[PDB]
């Protein structure tokens, strides 16, 4: 459908050499994904819908001066975005990076019945609303 001397690339794409990241920062960097857990104090849900590329945390030494957290981890501040885990791993493998997986936290069915809260032979009666 795109016939212009196409090369049948059967090997997984590895663009790691073009981006030119330091060698110590492509192997000694565990790269992980997950969909953020909702902030338990906030009942809002419109954040646990995307996968992200976040890394492992290196050391944070206090500055000899007033005390800023001086860091030498350039890749630490690299929270990416991903619509689906399949696209998330696709980025991970395309620039081959030591990675692990994680399953989307899926809600369970809350069987809710306000009529249950008051009962005669059932113990789910609530003493105070």
């Amino acid at each position: 459908t795109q016939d212009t001397q196409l090369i049948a690339v059967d090997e997984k794409l590895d663009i790691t050499t073009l981006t030119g990241v330091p060698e110590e920062h492509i192997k000694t960097r565990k790269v992980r994904i997950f969909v953020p857990a909702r902030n338990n104090m906030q009942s809002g849900v419109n954040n646990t819908k995307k996968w992200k590329m976040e890394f492992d945390t290196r050391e944070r030494w206090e500055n000899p001066l007033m005390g800023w957290s001086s860091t030498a981890d350039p890749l630490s501040n690299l929270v990416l975005t991903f619509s689906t885990k399949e696209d998330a791993v696709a980025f991970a493998e395309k620039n081959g990076w030591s990675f692990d997986v994680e399953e989307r936290k899926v809600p369970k069915p809350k069987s809710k019945s306000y009529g249950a809260n008051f009962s005669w032979n059932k113990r789910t009666r609530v003493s105070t609303k």
Partner: protein
Amino acid sequence: AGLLKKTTGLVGLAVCETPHERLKILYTKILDVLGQIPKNAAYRKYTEQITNEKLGMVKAEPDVKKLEEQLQGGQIEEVILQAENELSLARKMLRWKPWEPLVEEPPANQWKWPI
């Protein structure tokens, strides 16, 4: 016609001493170069309509002054440029062949905004 202008209002482009018949002959050019395009193609049905019309009002009144506001193309000297540009296209897609359907649908959700 009238007195031939000295400046077109744009540097580089000069007043043509041969305004209408030059535009006409190159217009007959863009009738015939369009010939080797099949009729079902959309660009033909757009072009020959826009072609065969403005070949009309140029021969409708040979004078330069009225024809500026016949086509809303400004001064005639830039209409020569733009009609030539339309000629360039007819030569361009003579090899582009832009009428068989869309090459391939975009890769999954390749637009998908927002993400």
